[PDB]
């Protein structure tokens, strides 16, 4: 049975190879078991320095979510996270605005809705709008990585045409698509 919690299922992967793009990180995820798992209940991570994959930097980056880590990974040069689960959204129009170092991809109901397919120092992109056709728990997944140096990841979402944005957190996240009461 899968744990029901108000968050996404988190997996962390580290590597001593260079992560240059989304393909490289997804290949890392498919290559092995997660180096750690966690509950992603407050998806606003970092900012920090001196490589996410070194020392306790992952714990610092994950902050409020670090207390759910399954283990303390050893050192790597490069690393990233894969989050998957569900997000409660009412039918309507939305767009992401993401602050990140390095890149990332977010999908909703299997369709990319926010993509940065390269390394970058901290940058904020306002992404194109997408529609939700039916109110309820939408499938969501995210990948983010750090090739080294600084690291930050804060996807925010707007329901009102970019006037206000919110962090994805325990108010609307579900690990399985059932209603969490945690």
Ligand X SMILES: CO[C@H]1O[C@H](CO)[C@@H](O)[C@H](O)[C@H]1O
Residues 149-168: x/- map of binding to ligand X (CB under 6 A)? xx------------------
- Residue 141, annotated ligand binder? no
CA-angle at 79, arms to 76 and 83, nearest 5°: 145
Q: Is 147 in the site for ligand X (CB under 6 A)?
A: yes
Nearest CA to 54 out of 15, 23, 82 is that of 15
What does residue 99 show for φ and ψ, rounded to 5 degrees?
-100, 125
Q: Is 101 in the site for ligand X (CB under 6 A)?
A: yes
Q: Is 35 in the site for Ca ion (CB under 5 A)?
A: no
Q: Is 120 in the site for ligand X (CB under 6 A)?
A: yes
DSSP E strand stretches across 5-135: 8-15, 36-40, 45-48, 78-89, 92-101, 104-108, 111-116, 123-126, 130-132
Q: Which stretch binds Ca ion (CB under 5 A): 89-97, 110-118, 143-151, 167-175?
A: 143-151
**Residue facing ligand X at closest CB distance:** 149
Task: Kindly list the distances between the CA atom of residue 175 and the CA atoms of 87, 99, 147, 171, 180, in Å, as whole numbers in the listed order.
Answer: 9, 24, 28, 12, 8
Using CA atoms, how far apart are residues 119 and 128, in angstroms rounded to an integer?
20
**Residue facing Ca ion at closest CB distance:** 63
**Residue length of the chain:** 182
Using CA atoms, how far apart are residues 138 and 108, in angstroms rounded to an integer?
7
Which CB sits closer to ligand X, 5 or 151? 151
Site for Ca ion in 70-89 (CB under 5 A): 72-73, 77-78
Which CB sits closer to Ca ion, 29 or 139? 29
Task: Tell me whether strands 151-158 and 166-167 are parallel, antiparallel or unpaired.
Answer: antiparallel
Which CB sits closer to ligand X, 62 or 108? 62
Q: Which two tokens stand for residue 42?
A: 């407050």
Q: Residues annotated in the binding site for Ca(2+), as ranges?
A: 2, 13, 18, 29, 32, 55, 64, 67, 72-73, 78, 101-102, 110, 121, 134, 146-148, 150, 159, 163
Residues at the interface with Ca ion (CB under 5 A): 18, 29, 63-64, 67, 72-73, 77-78, 101-102, 121, 146-149
Residues of each annotated binding site for alpha-L-arabinopyanose? 101-102, 147, 150
């Amino acid at each position: 049975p899968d744990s029901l919690f108000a968050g996404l299922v988190g997996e962390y992967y580290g590597t001593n190879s260079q992560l240059n793009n989304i393909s490289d990180f997804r290949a890392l995820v498919d290559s092995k078991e997660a180096d750690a798992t966690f509950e992603a209940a407050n998806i606003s991570y970092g900012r920090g320095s001196s490589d996410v994959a070194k020392g306790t930097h992952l714990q610092e980056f994950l902050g409020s979510d670090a207390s759910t880590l399954s283990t303390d990974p050893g050192d790597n040069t490069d690393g990233g996270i894969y989050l998957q689960g569900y997000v409660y959204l009412e039918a309507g129009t939305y767009n992401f605005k993401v602050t990140a170092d390095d890149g990332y991809e977010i999908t909703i109901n299997g369709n990319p809705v926010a993509t940065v397919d390269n390394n970058q120092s901290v940058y904020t992109v306002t992404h194109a709008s997408f529609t939700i056709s039916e109110s309820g728990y939408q499938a969501i997944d995210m990948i983010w990585w750090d090739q080294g140096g600084d690291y930050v990841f804060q996807p925010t979402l707007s329901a009102d045409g970019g006037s206000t944005y919110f962090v994805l957190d325990s108010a609307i996240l579900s690990s399985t698509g059932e209603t969490p009461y945690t």
